[PDB]
Amino acid sequence: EMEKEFEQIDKSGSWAAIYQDIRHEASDFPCRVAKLPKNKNRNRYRDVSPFDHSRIKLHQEDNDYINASLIKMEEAQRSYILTQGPLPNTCGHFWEMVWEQKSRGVVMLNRVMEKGSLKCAQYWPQKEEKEMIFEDTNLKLTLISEDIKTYYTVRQLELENLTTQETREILHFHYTTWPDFGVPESPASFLNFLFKVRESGSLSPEHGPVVVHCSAGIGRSGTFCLADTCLLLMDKRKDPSSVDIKKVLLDMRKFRMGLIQTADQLRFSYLAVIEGAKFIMGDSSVQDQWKELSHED
Numbered sequence: 037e038m039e040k041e042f043e044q045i046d047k048s049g050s051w052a053a054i055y056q057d058i059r060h061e062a063s064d065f066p067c068r069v070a071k072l073p074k075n076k077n078r079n080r081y082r083d084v085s086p087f088d089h090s091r092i093k094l095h096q097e098d099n100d101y102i103n104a105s106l107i108k109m110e111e112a113q114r115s116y117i118l119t120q121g122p123l124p125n126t127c128g129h130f131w132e133m134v135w136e137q138k139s140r141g142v143v144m145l146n147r148v149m150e151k152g153s154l155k156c157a158q159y160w161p162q163k164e165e166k167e168m169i170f171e172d173t174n175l176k177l178t179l180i181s182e183d184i185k186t187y188y189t190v191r192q193l194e195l196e197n198l199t200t201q202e203t204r205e206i207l208h209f210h211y212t213t214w215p216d217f218g219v220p221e222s223p224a225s226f227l228n229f230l231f232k233v234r235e236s237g238s239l240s241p242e243h244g245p246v247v248v249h250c251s252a253g254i255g256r257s258g259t260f261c262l263a264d265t266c267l268l269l270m271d272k273r274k275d276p277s278s279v280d281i282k283k284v285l286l287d288m289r290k291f292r293m294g295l296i297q298t299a300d301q302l303r304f305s306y307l308a309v310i311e312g313a314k315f316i317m318g319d320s321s322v323q324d325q326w327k328e329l330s331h332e333d
């Protein structure tokens with residue numbers, strides 16, 4: 037059991053070592069394209085790249101490079117797209133990706149300013165009356181509404197492919213209290229956001245992969261995807277002890293680098309998945325307990 041391992045790691049304070057183990061076992065595959073000189077201004081960190089195998093390719097002819105990776109979880113039957121926070125030059129690539137990959141939702145786990153620095157472009161409209169149009173990829177984008185909570189906001193956006201005048205709705209889920217290189221205020225808070233997401237149809241298979249990003253597309257996003265996939269795995273079986281989290285993390289590792297930046301993030305992931313297991317194991321009343329605790333309003 038994870039509860040047992042948790043309490044054993046925790047007892048001898050070995051989270052750091054465990055985490056180090058992970059970093060050390062993880063897959064290293066090439067990122068040749070990402071390191072092409074024409075893509076310098078496309079990546080936001082020297083050090084966080086999409087592996088070639090798993091990268092998402094734009095359907096442009098010019099340059100198909102986006103810093104984004106499909107994480108495709110086979111056994112859990114759930115894909116996501118992890119990306120960095122769009123640069124001012126790639127905001128139009130980001131929405132082309134969402135257009136082409138056919139995504140329903142975008143989860144933003146970061147604030148555009150964090151820790152004094154601009155972590156991410158303002159890539160969606162913050163108001164009504166003033167849409168965006170990305171000339172380079174021929175897409176228009178409009179705020180339709182938003183539902184501001186204490187720690188997160190759900191936006192409904194309209195995306196049109198101005199070449200065909202096809203339109204689609206995108207749910208944006210913005211977690212605004214997950215500190216960069218940190219963990220959320222509590223498991224109840226995280227699991228309450230996670231389930232807003234789920235409820236909404238975004239992570240469902242009639243749709244393309246949910247786009248998940250923070251600033252880099254690795255710490256925060258890996259942290260999210262990890263809990264989700266672990267809950268989904270236990271869900272099919274109703275068998276928690278078939279879930280190995282560190283092994284799950286290593287399957288994601290194969291598809292994007294750096295998924296989960298710290299050992300407290302790892303630790304938080306066990307907390308999240310052990311708590312949510314309540315709900316997967318038929319106590320559906322915990323889901324509103326999460327909402328109380330959460331102070332969503």
Ligand SMILES: O=C(O)C(=O)Nc1ccccc1C(=O)O
Pocket residue numbers: 081084146155216217250251252253254255256257297
């Ligand atoms: O945005 C995150 O959550 C994350 O993974 N961040 C980062 C990861 C790698 C390098 C830099 C950052 C950063 O934001 O400075």
